[PDB]
Design an enzyme around this catalytic site. Structure first.
Site, PDB file in Angstrom:
ATOM      1  N   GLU A  35       0.898  -1.187   0.113  1.00 33.95           N
ATOM      2  CA  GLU A  35       0.135   0.055   0.078  1.00 33.95           C
ATOM      3  C   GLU A  35       0.966   1.252  -0.090  1.00 33.95           C
ATOM      4  O   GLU A  35       0.640   2.317  -0.686  1.00 33.95           O
ATOM      5  CB  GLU A  35      -0.832  -0.106   1.300  1.00 33.95           C
ATOM      6  N   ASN A  46      -8.217   9.637  -5.107  1.00 35.06           N
ATOM      7  CA  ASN A  46      -9.081   8.796  -5.882  1.00 35.06           C
ATOM      8  C   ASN A  46     -10.221   9.818  -6.645  1.00 35.06           C
ATOM      9  O   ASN A  46     -10.933  10.013  -6.012  1.00 35.06           O
ATOM     10  CB  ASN A  46      -9.663   7.781  -5.374  1.00 35.06           C
ATOM     11  N   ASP A  49     -13.929   8.956  -7.140  1.00 35.74           N
ATOM     12  CA  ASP A  49     -15.071   8.983  -5.981  1.00 35.74           C
ATOM     13  C   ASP A  49     -14.682  10.035  -5.234  1.00 35.74           C
ATOM     14  O   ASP A  49     -15.547  10.326  -4.057  1.00 35.74           O
ATOM     15  CB  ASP A  49     -15.350   7.549  -5.386  1.00 35.74           C
ATOM     16  N   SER A  51     -12.262  10.486  -2.824  1.00 38.51           N
ATOM     17  CA  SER A  51     -11.870  10.197  -1.467  1.00 38.51           C
ATOM     18  C   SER A  51     -10.169  10.157  -1.567  1.00 38.51           C
ATOM     19  O   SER A  51      -9.928  10.159  -2.765  1.00 38.51           O
ATOM     20  CB  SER A  51     -12.508   8.786  -1.302  1.00 38.51           C
ATOM     21  N   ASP A  53      -6.762   8.170   0.393  1.00 32.12           N
ATOM     22  CA  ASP A  53      -6.177   7.064   0.968  1.00 32.12           C
ATOM     23  C   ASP A  53      -5.025   7.671   1.963  1.00 32.12           C
ATOM     24  O   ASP A  53      -4.211   8.455   1.382  1.00 32.12           O
ATOM     25  CB  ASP A  53      -5.660   5.936   0.113  1.00 32.12           C
ATOM     26  N   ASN A  60      -9.013   4.532   3.661  1.00 32.51           N
ATOM     27  CA  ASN A  60      -9.777   5.515   2.836  1.00 32.51           C
ATOM     28  C   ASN A  60     -10.677   6.131   3.613  1.00 32.51           C
ATOM     29  O   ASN A  60     -11.281   6.026   4.781  1.00 32.51           O
ATOM     30  CB  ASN A  60     -10.620   4.563   1.911  1.00 32.51           C
TER      31      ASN A  60
END
Length: 130
Positions: A35, A46, A49, A51, A53, A60
């Site tokens: 990750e 992102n 959408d 959002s 991370d 998220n």
């Protein structure tokens, strides 16, 4: 901060992640590696959408932490997303534990499925003394 492999393994062990909700330490190691490269300051937006991370486990903002700018989001860990960018990972770990308490468990992270599921993950903790 960018952790070294064995330094992180010992830290996670101390924070009680080995076998948390059935997930071995090597699985958590595999997840952090893919990750964020063991980087606590990593952030990934992102566009899809709206959002973001955050941190070492790339948690998220749609469900787990509040960043205020994600539409229709919740904050199940009850934390500011800023908390997930600290060098000290205690908050990030407490939140990761909350994520796996949901039915999907570790499968909640697609990178885990792509890169860690059904693989020999022993590599991530070999020689760390954990």
């Amino acid at each position: 901060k960018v952790f070294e492999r064995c330094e992180l393994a010992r830290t996670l062990k101390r924070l009680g992640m080995d076998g948390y909700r059935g997930i071995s330490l090597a699985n958590w190691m595999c997840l952090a590696k893919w990750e964020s490269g063991y980087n606590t300051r990593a952030t990934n937006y992102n566009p899809g959408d709206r959002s973001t991370d955050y941190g070492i486990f790339q948690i998220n903002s749609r469900y787990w932490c509040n960043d205020g700018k994600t539409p229709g989001a919740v904050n199940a860990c009850h934390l500011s997303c800023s908390a997930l960018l600290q060098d000290n990972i205690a908050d990030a770990v407490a939140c990761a534990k909350r994520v796996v308490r949901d039915p999907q468990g570790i499968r909640a992270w697609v990178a885990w499925r792509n890169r860690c599921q059904n693989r020999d993950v022993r590599q991530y903790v070999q020689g760390c003394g954990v």
